[PDB]
UniProtKB/Swiss-Prot annotation:
Class of this enzyme: hydrolase
Biological process (GO), any one: cellulose catabolic process
Stretches for region Catalytic: 1-358
Record EC number: 3.2.1.4
The protein, known as: Endoglucanase E1
Record keywords: Carbohydrate metabolism, Cellulose degradation, Disulfide bond, Glycosidase, Hydrolase, Polysaccharide degradation, Signal
Reported function: Has a very high specific activity on carboxymethylcellulose.
Source species: Acidothermus cellulolyticus (strain ATCC 43068 / DSM 8971 / 11B)
Temperature-dependent activity: Optimum temperature is 81 degrees Celsius. Thermostable.
Length: 358
């Protein structure tokens, strides 16, 4: 399944033939950093990497980028061209992105572009900064939309990575109301290609209640994002364990029984109530503590195993494929070749199937 551009129907995503599909993928970061390209191409051929992602059973790649790669002549700076990647030589970050998107389509994978950082220096709480205005943000989203218009390999956009304090959901103040910003951006994107799915993340605090950046969608029920083209919206949340931040609910004595309460509250309810599909965009852990291992086992079950629920479940993209992620580690090990079959083992009940070639 997976043919053509997708659309929502209740809490599910459906391909063009109306067959339900499930995004069960991985994050492959690099384009958002100051290397201006996905990491690991210093040890592997990109195609050999894409083929291995497919082999492990992952069907979608969330590809983080920063507005820097849209500046004229921006080139990658961490690729090795000996006996590999010979065709990426002399190409700009964008042209290298076109190659990755193209091969991914052919082998049956899909891509979701994620505006991870305003610039390669770091993330931002708001969707704009003094150096990267809101208009650049929108022009850039429209440019990428235009660039891949007609190639269903790119199924949709993750508007802004991890909006957080001081951002608000529904407060009505245009300078911090992420809810209004997402509609503003989403509608600009849909004006270029109205078949793209629009993935909108949450904030951090809502009603004095704090949660992971990008994961607080508590205001969504009361203050929905409303787009010009219906059945394109998918809410998104992020959730992590102690390897990232020793949140307090991990110290709760009833842990992990308290978890589904937290999850239901902040994002699950949109799914449970069949309002719209929900995508856990980032989640990972080094699995060093027994707590993260229990957290992962628990969470994997909450997201609904494919054997039981099929496509009527939560969409997900784990973090990350890269082994060079500070406090989460990744599926590959430090050699960019050996799989961490153990961590990979936990995600098995929620993996789905590879899509149709594009
Ligand atoms: O992008 C390349 C870069 O990625 C890093 O991995 C990051 C992800 O990129 C990022 O999206 C994700 O965001 C984290 C953030 O890093 C944490 O510091 C933050 O912790 C917050 C917490 O959310 C709050 O609730 C709490 O109150 O405060 C703390 C901060 O003090 O939580 C968000 C998640 O919502 O985190 C990933 C892992 O760090 C890699 O680390 C880096 O090596 C890569 O180069």
């Amino acid at each position: 399944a997976g043919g053509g551009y997708w659309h929502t129907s209740g809490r599910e995503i459906l391909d063009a033939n109306n067959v339900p599909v499930r995004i069960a993928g991985i994050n492959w970061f690099g384009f958002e950093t100051c290397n201006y390209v996905v990491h690991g191409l210093w040890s592997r051929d990109y195609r050999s990497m894409l083929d291995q992602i497919k082999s492990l059973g992952y069907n979608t790649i969330r590809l983080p980028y920063s507005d820097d790669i849209l500046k004229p002549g921006t080139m990658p700076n961490s690729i090795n061209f000996y006996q590999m990647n010979q065709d990426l030589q002399g190409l700009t970050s964008l042209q290298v992105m076109d190659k990755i998107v193209a091969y991914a389509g052919q082998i049956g994978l899909r891509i979701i572009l994620d505006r991870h950082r305003p610039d390669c220096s770091g993330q931002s709480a708001l969707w704009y900064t003094s150096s990267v205005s809101e208009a650049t943000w929108i022009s850039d989203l429209q440019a990428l939309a235009q660039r891949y218009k007609g190639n269903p390999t790119v199924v949709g956009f993750d508007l802004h990575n991890e909006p957080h304090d001081p951002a608000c959901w529904g407060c009505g103040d245009p300078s911090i109301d992420w809810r209004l910003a997402a509609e503003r951006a989403g509608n600009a994107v849909l004006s270029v290609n109205p078949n793209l799915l629009i993935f909108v993340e949450g904030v951090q605090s809502y009603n004095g209640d704090s949660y992971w950046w990008g994961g607080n969608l508590q205001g969504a029920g009361q203050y929905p994002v409303v787009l010009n083209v219906p059945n394109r919206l998918v809410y998104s949340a992020h959730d992590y364990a102690t390897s990232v931040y020793p949140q307090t609910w991990f110290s709760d004595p009833t842990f992990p029984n308290n978890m589904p309460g937290i999850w239901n509250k902040n994002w699950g309810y949109l799914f449970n109530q069949n309002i719209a599909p929900v995508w856990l965009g980032e989640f990972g852990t080094t699995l060093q503590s027994t707590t993260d291992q229990t957290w992962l086992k628990t969470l994997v079950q909450y997201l609904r195993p494919t054997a039981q629920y099929g496509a009527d479940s939560f969409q997900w993209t784990f973090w990350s494929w890269n082994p060079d992620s500070g406090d989460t580690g990744g599926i590959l090990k430090d050699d960019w070749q050996t799989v961490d079959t153990v961590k990979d083992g936990y995600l098995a009940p929620i993996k789905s199937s590879i899509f149709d070639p594009v």
